[PDB]
Every structure is written in C-alpha cells, then in structure tokens.
C-alpha cells in the first residue's frame, strides 16, 4: 500500500500514531500551557512486522520557560523504557504562544533522534494557533547541516532548508488505537 522514502532514497518503515495522542498530550500538559510554559514528551512504542506502533506518551522529568523545555533526568527515562522494552520513536512539545515550526533547539535535539532512528518524528503543537505539525529533518542534507553545526546559541539560524513535514499517511499514519500516558514528573 505505502512505501515512504527519504531524500536520499532510503526506505522508511511506517509509524502508527494514536489519533488521540496529540489531543491527550495537550490535556495532560494544559496547566503549563496556561502558565505559558512549554512541555515535552517522548513517543514510545514497539516494532512489530517492520512497522512501529506508538503505545506510550512519556512525560519525563523536565524544566521549561515560555521559550524552552528540556529533560533533567534521562536516567530514569532510560530505566522506564528499558524495563518495559519501549523504543524511542520520536518526541513532542508545545508552543504555547508561537506558530507551529521547528526551532533551532528542536532541530538540534531531533537530529540526534533521527540519526539513531531514521523514522523518528518530532510533533510540535501550537495551541494558541490551534495548529500542530509532524516534522523531520531532510535526510541526508538536513541531518548533515545540523551535525556539522557547532554554533553556540539557543535560537541561532541555519542556512539552507533543514527540515520538512512528514508525509502522511505514508511515513506516519494516524490511527484508532490505544495509548498509555506515563507521567514521570
Ligand atoms: Zn545549529
């Protein structure tokens, strides 16, 4: 039915995302959005038959401003995932006031995830704008740009096109399946 490919011609296995996830993530983190604070989550799941299914939304121990968010204890994130045999399939964070786009920070974070898993996706929610997006870096050219990048500075620019929206429903298909939310905060 569906074969998705990167810019470099490598095949991408399908990721099945619960349609409820986006909505549910906004629900659980709504208090921070109120206080104009970003929140991040991890999309976790399993590989069955050359396709990935997102089964858990994990909210890690974190810190945030209206501009940023970041994990503060990846050790217990690891232990949880290791204990329950859960793959890191991507991640999600909010833009309480902003438009829907991948920031410099997000691109640097996601680059590493996508190198470790070419299908890895970054979801960004913009509640205030009532828009959301599912993104990934161009592969190989965007990954290359961010890998070589050594600019200090949280909101610095990059030159050239670096990321793109994931094509749905080819790479990511939103379905009608279960979801556990694990809040580690
Ligand atoms: Zn950079």
Listed residues: CB within 5 A of ion ligand 1: 149, 151
Per residue, the 3-state secondary structure of 117-169, as one string, reads CCCCEEEEEEHHHCEEEEEEECCCHHHHHHHHCCCCCCCCCCCCCCEEECCCC
24 CA distance to ligand 1 centroid (A)?
Answer: 31
Phi, psi of 161 (to 5 degrees): -75, 135
Residues 6+ apart with CB under 8 A from 174: 17, 18, 19, 168
Q: How was this structure determined?
A: X-ray
68 CA distance to ligand 1 centroid (A)?
Answer: 16
d(CA 185, CA 177): 25
DSSP β-ladder status, 69-71 and 62-64: antiparallel
DSSP β-ladder status, 51-59 and 180-183: parallel
For residue 93, give the nearest of 65, 55, 122, 71 by alpha carbon. 122
Q: Where are the domains of the chain?
A: 1-185
Helix, strand and coil content of the chain, in percent to the nearest 5, comes to 25, 35, 40
Length of the chain: 185
The CATH number of the domain covering residues in 1-185: 3.40.140.10
d(CA 69, CA 105): 10
Residues 6+ apart with CB under 8 A from 167: 4
Q: What is the largest CA-CA distance in the chain?
A: 44
103 CA distance to ligand 1 centroid (A)?
Answer: 10
36 CA distance to ligand 1 centroid (A)?
Answer: 25
149 CA distance to ligand 1 centroid (A)?
Answer: 5
DSSP secondary structure of 52-75 = EEEEEEEE-SEEE-SS-EEES-HH
For residue 31, give the nearest of 80, 74, 68, 64 by alpha carbon. 64
């Amino acid at each position: 039915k569906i074969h998705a490919y990167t810019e470099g011609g490598k095949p991408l296995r399908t990721i099945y995302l619960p349609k409820l996830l986006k909505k549910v993530f906004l629900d659980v983190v709504k208090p921070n959005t109120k206080k104009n604070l970003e929140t991040c989550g991890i999309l976790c799941g399993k590989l069955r038959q050359n396709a990935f299914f997102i089964t858990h939304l994990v909210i890690p121990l974190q810190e945030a401003t209206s501009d940023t968010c970041g994990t503060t204890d990846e050790a217990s994130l690891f232990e949880f995932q290791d204990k329950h045999n859960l793959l890191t399939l991507g991640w999600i964070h909010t833009h309480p006031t902003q438009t829907c786009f991948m920031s410099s920070v997000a691109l640097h974070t996601h680059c590493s995830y996508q190198l470790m898993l070419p299908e890895a996706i970054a979801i960004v929610m913009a509640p205030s704008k009532n828009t959301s997006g599912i993104f990934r870096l161009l592969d190989p050219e965007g990954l290359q740009t961010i890998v070589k990048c050594r600019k200090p500075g949280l909101f610095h620019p990059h030159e050239g096109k670096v990321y793109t929206m994931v094509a749905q429903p080819g790479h990511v298909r939103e379905i009608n399946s279960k979801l556990q939310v694990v809040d580690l905060r």
